[PDB]
């Protein structure tokens, strides 16, 4: 039943592209959204749009053809785009979390260093770290079935473990700690039912992030260990969970801001 | 004791005589006469420009005599001059005191004045020899915050302050040439007659007074409104003026008839009026309200015709151009909108 | 003295000449009707002549 | 014109009672909160009590609490202050004052030395 | 026309130069916190200042800049010039806690500031400035709070009260009854948008700027948590 799967994945891709384009247009047009806490949302939307415009269509084509018909160059290009965009999304979420944490825990000392220049520099650094994913995908041999698109380091235990930790687990633990501190601050304020809103929002954010990305990185390390004894359908399921994370990202961060909701309603 | 009571009785008796004389010259209400004139229709203006360069709330704006330049004052300590056609801002003058409450544009366009809680009226020479804007004079004779100021020439300015008095200043000498006294509460606004031979003032005592600039005496006092008067403006022909108070109503007064002519109030508005202005022909009376939106009133039938909306906070200032082509509206949301 | 200042000021305000309100009402109508054709806000002008 | 006329009383003996009335005209009495203020001889003006637009929210000062009562009759545009068990410290000039703006709960500047919306005041004297 | 094109080029160049400065000003403006200091004749609000129409004072705590404003050049009526402070971070209210005669006046002024359409969002840092004199007044016993506040006789010290080690229990009940009077006003109408921060203070209290800094943390923290919709 490849046709229904293609239909569903194309629908998801179109939804992702549409939502990201809508968010970017709303940011560009309103002129009331030109804040410093919204540049992070802009970067997140850009990363999700890149995921939903270049990566998902080629993944769907790969699934439909049961093999890579575009050749080695486009194979490498698509793999690099996928890795870079996913890392960009994760790091954008992380930097947004750090921004909110510093806003909540250092309200007066952060108002002095919350300039647009520093936010732009942080976004550029996150995207540079994400772009560092291009070095191994293109130069692993210097430093394989022809019908499959996969990297040359998919069975290296040390490298896969290091990447999985530095890319997912350390950000996840740091985000958990920062949002726990934010929740503690919210509780202290509620102390003067009130914790329901903050608990719900933080839990939703962290649950989406983890429940979407932890199966993929678990599979990452598991195939690094087993050395190719796993299945490919599981790999694609985890990859599409990672894609669904980017699809759902626009419905979490910008929809929690009244100005964004108003601008969306106007459009 | 006895003398004070006798004087009080005489004043009360004389006040009764004034009321009797005023009521004698009452043939018909302006509404009755205007029954045979056609309705104005439905005025629908739209935002043509939005001026956004202010950090804090805007407190006062004033149009230039060319109908293209205007100045505005914001409580961040800034005094911006804008080109309304291109939206470009020509000057940005930083003020020594952040709490400015009034700004004025010279009729010639050579100077700009401002004042506030510092109890001073600062004067800036816009057309300096070196091209900069610097304080030209500092008028420091008022004991109370400055509420309004309007240039009479490049050397004469009339100012009102929260000390219950208005003053006439000689900028060249920097001293009050004449002082106007008689208001019991803070004087909030002043409006100059087209001939500039006499002006009206509104204060926080529900009264308005007509002042003779040359004589320095109160020629006439108009008692209306229930609460503080926040705005006052002259009719284009100079024989009438309109006021707005915290009692959520605007009133039209006639200098020659010594009477109130019309009251512009609706049961659906219970907010105070912060600003008032007239149309070029005097047919429309535009009033800014605390409910964040302005109103357009038919100044001859008292029927509201038009509503200007699009400000996030209360509307603080309101002004129509000299040629009558556009109206500018400031607000506490730190934006100015041009409508036409 | 404050009462004396109040009464004397009130005497000055009680000696002016008053005209009928209908006469004043008519004059307000005349000025608006005479200048009705030079009021851009009252009568919207074509966009060709509008500087905004 | 906004005017407030108070008609109270004169000399009373300690432990007596007195009723002050304030007839208001020139404004819609129903839209304003009304205050009662006094100025003791050789002392500044102080707030005594105030009644709300509908009369549901009363408030008195600590010293006069329990003896003075404030009520209004919006139909007749009048304000009352019933004083019982008057003490020697209660001798002063009582003024009926109006809040500056309608439909508000805060009332600034009603105890200021010069306030436009305040009456002339009536002298209440208590002595043997 | 070439002249017209050059003329508009200068206007756009001029606007760019102004906008560059306005961005620098905005950064400084939002990193500074403006405070309205208002009190009374005997409040002692001048001593809390440990640095014509309006007086200004700047102090720095943990490298954060604070701007306090004392309006001393106006008259007794303040219903108009007080609308200029609808954006201040906090209002510093100083009341002398030793003068029971002038203490109901402070309650009336506090109530007006709290229930003001244009100050309905600002929070108040309350300083009860004379506690060394209040303790002396209570210990003497000549003057009774019950004469001016009849409900004091039925007041008991809060369980959460934290008396300073070695102070008479009679004084502790007097301190908290005065404090409670302002807190009853604050909590009667404030629907979670502004809060009161009571502090007991004396003239020799060196640690007063720190308390303002800590209360300013609380105020800004709540607003940020409100912007994120976490509260
Ligand atoms: N989820 C896209 C592939 C990737 C990104 N980072 C690590 N692996």
Domain borders along chain E are 2-228
Tell whether B25 is within 8 A of chain C (Cβ): yes
Query: What's E89-140 look like in SS3?
Result: CEEEEEECCCCCCCHHHHHHHHHHHHCCCCCCCCEEEEEECCCHHHHHHHHH
Q: What share of chain A is helix, strand, coil (3-state, %, to 5)?
A: 80, 0, 20
Question: How many CB pairs below 8 A link B and E?
Answer: 87
Tell whether E108 is within 8 A of chain D (Cβ): yes
CB atoms within 10 A of CB A125: 12
Chain centre distance of CA A103 = 22
CATH classification code of E2-228: 3.40.50.300
Q: Distance between CA atoms of B74 and B51, rounded to whole angstroms?
A: 13
Token reading at B67:
């109908």
Q: Distance between CA atoms of B277 and B236, rounded to whole angstroms?
A: 10
Short-list D76, D77, D114, D108, CA closest to D95: D114
Contact B7 C4 (CB under 8 A): yes
Q: Distance between CA atoms of B244 and A140, rounded to whole angstroms?
A: 78
Distance A235 CA to ligand 1 centre (A): 11
B27 and C22 Cβ atoms separated by less than 8 Å? yes
Domains of chain B by range and CATH?
A: 2-339 (2.130.10.10)
**Strand B218-223 versus strand B207-212 pairing type:** antiparallel
* 3-class DSSP assignment, residue B198: strand
What distance in Å separates residue C13's CA from the closest CA in chain B? Answer: 6
Q: Which residues of A make up each annotated binding site for histamine?
A: 82, 87, 167, 216
Chain centre distance of CA A176 = 16
Which residue bears the tokens 């919210």? A186
B112 and B120 Cβ atoms separated by less than 8 Å? no
Tell whether E120 is within 8 A of chain D (Cβ): no
- Evaluate: CB of A92 within 6 angstroms of ligand 1: no
- Evaluate: CB of A238 within 6 angstroms of ligand 1: no
Contact D106 E78 (CB under 8 A): no
For ligand 1, atom 7, name the residue with the nearest CA.
A83
DSSP structure class, residue E163: P
- Across the strands, what pairs with B114? B103, B122
Q: With contacts defined as CB-CB under 8 Å, which chain E residues touch B75?
A: 84, 87
D5 and D121 Cβ atoms separated by less than 8 Å? no
Q: Distance between CA atoms of B293 and B304, rounded to whole angstroms?
A: 13
**Phi, psi for residue D62 in degrees, rounded to 5:** -65, -40
Give the residue on B whose Cα is nearest the Cα of C24. B257
Q: Please name the helix (run of DSSP H) or strand (run of DSSP E) that holds residue B220, with its range, or none.
A: strand B218-223
* 3-class DSSP assignment, residue D93: strand
Give the residue on E whose Cα is nearest the Cα of D116. E77
Q: With contacts defined as CB-CB under 8 Å, which chain E residues touch D109?
A: 76-79
What distance in Å separates residue C49's CA from the closest CA in chain B? Answer: 10
Chain centre distance of CA B112 = 17
For ligand 1, atom 8, name the residue with the nearest CA.
A83
Which residues lie below 8 Å from residue A250, measured CB to CB, with a gap of 6+? A16, A19, A20, A22, A23, A44, A45, A48
Query: What's A168-202 look like in SS3?
Result: HHHHHHHHHHHHHHHHHHHHHHHCCCCHHHHHHHH
Q: Which of A86, A134, A223 to mutate to test the pocket of ligand 1 (most atoms within 8 A of CB)?
A: A86
What is the CATH superfamily name and number for domain D3-126? Immunoglobulins (2.60.40.10)
B145 and E75 Cβ atoms separated by less than 8 Å? no
Which residues lie below 8 Å from residue A164, measured CB to CB, with a gap of 6+? A217, A220, A221
Token reading at E23:
């961005």
Question: How many CB pairs below 8 A link B and C?
Answer: 153
Write out the DSSP string of D24-39: EESS-GGGS-EEEEEE
Q: Distance between CA atoms of E117 and D103, rounded to whole angstroms?
A: 11
Token reading at D48:
């005594």
Q: Residue D112 is nearest to which of E76, E115, E116, comparing CB atoms? A: E76
- Evaluate: CB of A83 within 6 angstroms of ligand 1: yes
A174 and A242 Cβ atoms separated by less than 8 Å? no
B193 and B201 Cβ atoms separated by less than 8 Å? no
Mutating which of C32, C38, C46, C48 best tests the B interface, going by the most B Cβ atoms within 10 A? C32
* 3-class DSSP assignment, residue C16: coil
Contact C10 B68 (CB under 8 A): no
| Cα end-to-end span (Å), chain B | 61
Q: Distance between CA atoms of D51 and D57, rounded to whole angstroms?
A: 6
What is the C-alpha R_g of chain E?
Answer: 22
Which residues lie below 8 Å from residue B231, measured CB to CB, with a gap of 6+? B188, B189, B202, B243, B244, B273, B274, B275, B276, B287, B288, B318
CB atoms within 10 A of CB B79: 22
Mutating which of C9, C16, C17, C18 best tests the B interface, going by the most B Cβ atoms within 10 A? C18
Which residue bears the tokens 């008057």? D86
DSSP structure class, residue E196: B
Short-list B271, B178, B254, CA closest to B220: B254
Q: Residue D116 is nearest to which of B184, B246, B272, comparing CB atoms? A: B184
Q: Distance between CA atoms of E95 and E99, rounded to whole angstroms?
A: 9
Experimental determination approach used:
cryo-EM
What distance in Å separates residue D87's CA from the closest CA in chain E? Answer: 13
Q: Please name the helix (run of DSSP H) or strand (run of DSSP E) that holds residue B80, with its range, or none.
A: strand B78-83
**Chain B residue set in contact with D, beta carbons under 8 Å:** 184-185, 204-207, 223, 226-228, 246-248, 270, 272
Token reading at E181:
């009077």
Q: Distance between CA atoms of E72 and E49, rounded to whole angstroms?
A: 14
H helix runs in chain E, sequence order: 2-31, 45-48, 103-114, 132-140, 169-189, 209-227
Contact C28 B300 (CB under 8 A): yes
**Strand B259-264 versus strand D58-60 pairing type:** unpaired
Which residues lie below 8 Å from residue E6, measured CB to CB, with a gap of 6+? none
Mutating which of B227, B229, B260, B274 best tests the D interface, going by the most D Cβ atoms within 10 A? B227
* 3-class DSSP assignment, residue D85: coil
Token reading at A91:
């790091």
What distance in Å separates residue D58's CA from the closest CA in chain B? Answer: 23
B230 and B290 Cβ atoms separated by less than 8 Å? no
- Evaluate: CB of A43 within 6 angstroms of ligand 1: no
For ligand 1, atom 3, name the residue with the nearest CA.
A83
Q: Distance between CA atoms of D44 and C37, rounded to whole angstroms?
A: 60
- The domain limits of chain A are 2-266
Tell whether C30 is within 8 A of chain B (Cβ): no
- Evaluate: CB of A87 within 6 angstroms of ligand 1: yes
Model resolution, angstroms: 2.8
Contact E77 D65 (CB under 8 A): no
Mutating which of A102, A183, A189 best tests the E interface, going by the most E Cβ atoms within 10 A? A189
- The domain limits of chain D are 3-126
B169 and B111 Cβ atoms separated by less than 8 Å? no
Helices (H) and strands (E) in chain D, counts: 0, 10
Give the residue on A whose Cα is nearest the Cα of E227. A257
Q: Residue C42 is nearest to which of B34, B219, B281, comparing CB atoms? A: B281
Asked if chain A contacts chain D via 3 or more Cβ pairs within 8 Å, the reply is no
* 3-class DSSP assignment, residue B248: coil
- CATH architecture of structural domain A2-266: Up-down Bundle (1.20)
CB atoms within 10 A of CB B314: 22
Tell whether D43 is within 8 A of chain E (Cβ): no
Give the residue on E whose Cα is nearest the Cα of A202. E230
Q: Please name the helix (run of DSSP H) or strand (run of DSSP E) that holds residue B79, with its range, or none.
A: strand B78-83
- Across the strands, what pairs with B318? B329
Q: With contacts defined as CB-CB under 8 Å, which chain A residues touch E62?
A: 108-109
* 3-class DSSP assignment, residue B317: strand
Write out the DSSP string of B137-173: EEE---SS-EEEEEESSSSEEEEEETTS-EEEEETTT
Q: Residue E231 is nearest to which of A103, A115, A189, comparing CB atoms? A: A189
For ligand 1, atom 2, name the residue with the nearest CA.
A83
């Amino acid at each position: 039943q490849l046709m229904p799967l293609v239909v569903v994945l194309s629908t998801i891709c179109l939804v992702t592209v549409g939502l990201n384009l809508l968010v970017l247009y709303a940011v560009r047009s309103e002129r009331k959204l030109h804040t410093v806490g919204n540049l992070y949302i802009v970067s997140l939307s850009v990363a999700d749009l890149i995921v939903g415009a270049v990566v998902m269509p080629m993944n769907i084509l790969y699934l439909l053809m049961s093999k890579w018909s575009l050749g080695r160059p486009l194979c490498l290009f698509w793999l690099s785009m996928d890795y870079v965009a996913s890392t960009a999304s994760i790091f954008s979420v992380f930097i947004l979390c750090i921004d909110r944490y510093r806003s909540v825990q250092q309200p007066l000392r952060y108002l002095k260093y919350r300039t647009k220049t520093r936010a732009s520099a942080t976004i550029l650094g996150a995207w540079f770290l994400s772009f560092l994913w291009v070095i191994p995908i293109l130069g692993w041999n210097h430093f394989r079935r022809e019908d499959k698109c996969e990297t040359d380091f998919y069975d290296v235990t040390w490298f896969k473990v290091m990447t999985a930790i530095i890319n997912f687990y350390l950000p996840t633990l740091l985000m958990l700690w920062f949002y726990a501190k934010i929740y503690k601050a919210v509780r202290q304020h509620c102390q003067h039912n009130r914790e329901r809103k903050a608990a719900k929002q933080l839990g939703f954010i962290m649950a989406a992030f983890i429940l979407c990305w932890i199966p993929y990185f678990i599979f990452f390390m598991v195939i690094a260990f087993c050395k190719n004894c796993c299945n490919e359908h599981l790999h694609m399921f985890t990859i599409w969970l990672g894609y669904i994370n980017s699809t759902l990202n626009p419905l979490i961060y910008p929809l929690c801001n009244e100005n964004f909701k108003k601008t969306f309603k106007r459009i | 004791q006895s003398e004070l009571d006798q004087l009080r009785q005489e004043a009360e008796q004389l006040k009764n005589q004034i009321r009797d004389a005023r009521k004698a010259c009452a043939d018909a209400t302006l509404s009755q006469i205007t029954n045979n004139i056609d309705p104005v229709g439905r005025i629908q203006m739209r935002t043509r420009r939005t001026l956004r360069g202010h950090l804090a709330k805007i407190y006062a704006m004033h149009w230039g005599t060319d109908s293209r330049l205007l100045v505005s004052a914001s409580q961040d300590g800034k005094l911006i001059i804008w080109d309304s056609y291109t939206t470009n801002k020509v000057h940005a003058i930083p003020l020594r005191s952040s709490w400015v409450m009034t700004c004025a544009y010279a009729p010639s366009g050579n100077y700009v004045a401002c004042g506030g809680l510092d109890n001073i009226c600062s004067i800036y020479n816009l057309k300096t020899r070196e091209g900069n804007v610097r304080v030209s004079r500092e008028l420091a004779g008022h004991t109370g915050y400055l509420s309004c100021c309007r240039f009479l020439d490049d050397n004469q300015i009339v100012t009102s302050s929260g000390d219950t008095t208005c003053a006439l200043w000689d900028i060249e000498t920097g001293q009050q040439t004449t002082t106007f006294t008689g208001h019991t509460g803070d004087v909030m606004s002043l409006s100059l007659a087209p001939d500039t031979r006499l002006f009206v003032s509104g204060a926080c005592d529900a009264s308005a007074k007509l002042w003779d600039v040359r004589e320095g005496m109160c020629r006439q006092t108009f008692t209306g409104h229930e609460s503080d008067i926040n705005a006052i403006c002259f009719f284009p022909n100079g024989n009438a003026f309109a006021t707005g108070s915290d009692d959520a109503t605007c009133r039209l007064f006639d200098l020659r008839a010594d009477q109130e002519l019309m009251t512009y109030s609706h049961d659906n508005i219970i907010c105070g009026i912060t600003s008032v202005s007239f149309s070029k022909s005097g047919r429309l009376l535009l009033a800014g309200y605390d409910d964040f939106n302005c109103n357009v009133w038919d100044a001859l039938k008292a029927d509201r015709a038009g509503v200007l909306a699009g400000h996030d906070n209360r509307v603080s200032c309101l002004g129509v151009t000299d040629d009558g082509m556009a109206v500018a509206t400031g607000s506490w949301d730190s934006f100015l909108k041009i409508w036409n | 003295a404050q009462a004396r200042k109040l009464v004397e000021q009130l005497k000055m305000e009680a000696n002016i000449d008053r005209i009928k309100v209908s006469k004043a009402a008519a004059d307000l109508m005349a000025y608006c009707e005479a200048h009705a054709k030079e009021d851009p806000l009252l009568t919207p002008v074509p966009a060709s002549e509008n500087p905004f | 014109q906004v005017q407030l006329q108070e008609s109270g009383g004169g000399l009373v003996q300690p432990g007596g009672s007195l009723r002050l009335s304030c007839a208001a005209s020139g404004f819609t009495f129903s839209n304003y909160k009304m205050n009662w203020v006094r100025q003791a001889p050789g002392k500044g003006l102080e707030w005594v009590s105030d009644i709300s637009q509908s009369g549901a929210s009363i408030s008195y000062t600590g010293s006069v609490k329990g003896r003075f009562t404030i009520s209004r009759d919006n139909a007749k545009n009048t304000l009352y202050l019933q004083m019982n068990s008057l003490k020697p410290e209660d001798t002063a000039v009582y003024y009926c004052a109006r809040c500056p703006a309608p439909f508000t709960r805060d009332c600034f500047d009603v105890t200021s030395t010069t306030y436009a919306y305040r009456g002339q005041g009536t002298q209440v004297t208590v002595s043997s | 026309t070439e002249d017209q094109r050059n003329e508009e080029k200068a206007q756009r160049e001029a606007n760019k130069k102004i906008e560059k400065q306005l961005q620098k000003d905005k950064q400084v403006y939002r990193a500074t916190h403006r405070l309205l200091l208002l009190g009374a004749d005997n409040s002692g609000k001048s001593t809390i200042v440990k640095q014509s129409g309006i007086f200004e004072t700047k102090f720095q705590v943990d490298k954060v800049n604070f701007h306090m404003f004392d309006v001393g050049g106006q008259r007794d009526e303040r219903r108009k010039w007080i609308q200029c402070f609808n954006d201040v971070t906090a209002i510093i209210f100083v009341v002398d806690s030793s003068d029971y005669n002038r203490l109901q006046e402070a309650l009336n002024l506090f109530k007006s500031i709290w229930n003001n359409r244009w100050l309905r969002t600002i929070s108040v840092i309350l300083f009860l400035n004379k506690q060394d004199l209040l303790a002396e007044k209570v210990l003497a016993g000549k003057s009774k709070i019950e004469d001016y506040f009849p409900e004091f006789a039925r007041y008991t010290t809060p369980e959460d009260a934290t008396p300073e080690p070695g102070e008479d229990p009679r004084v502790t009940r007097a301190k908290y009854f005065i404090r409670d009077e302002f807190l009853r006003i604050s909590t009667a109408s404030g629907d979670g948008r502004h809060y009161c921060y009571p502090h007991f203070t004396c003239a020799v209290d060196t640690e007063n700027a720190r308390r303002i800094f800590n209360d300013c943390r609380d105020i800004i923290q709540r607003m940020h948590l409100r912007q994120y919709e976490l509260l």
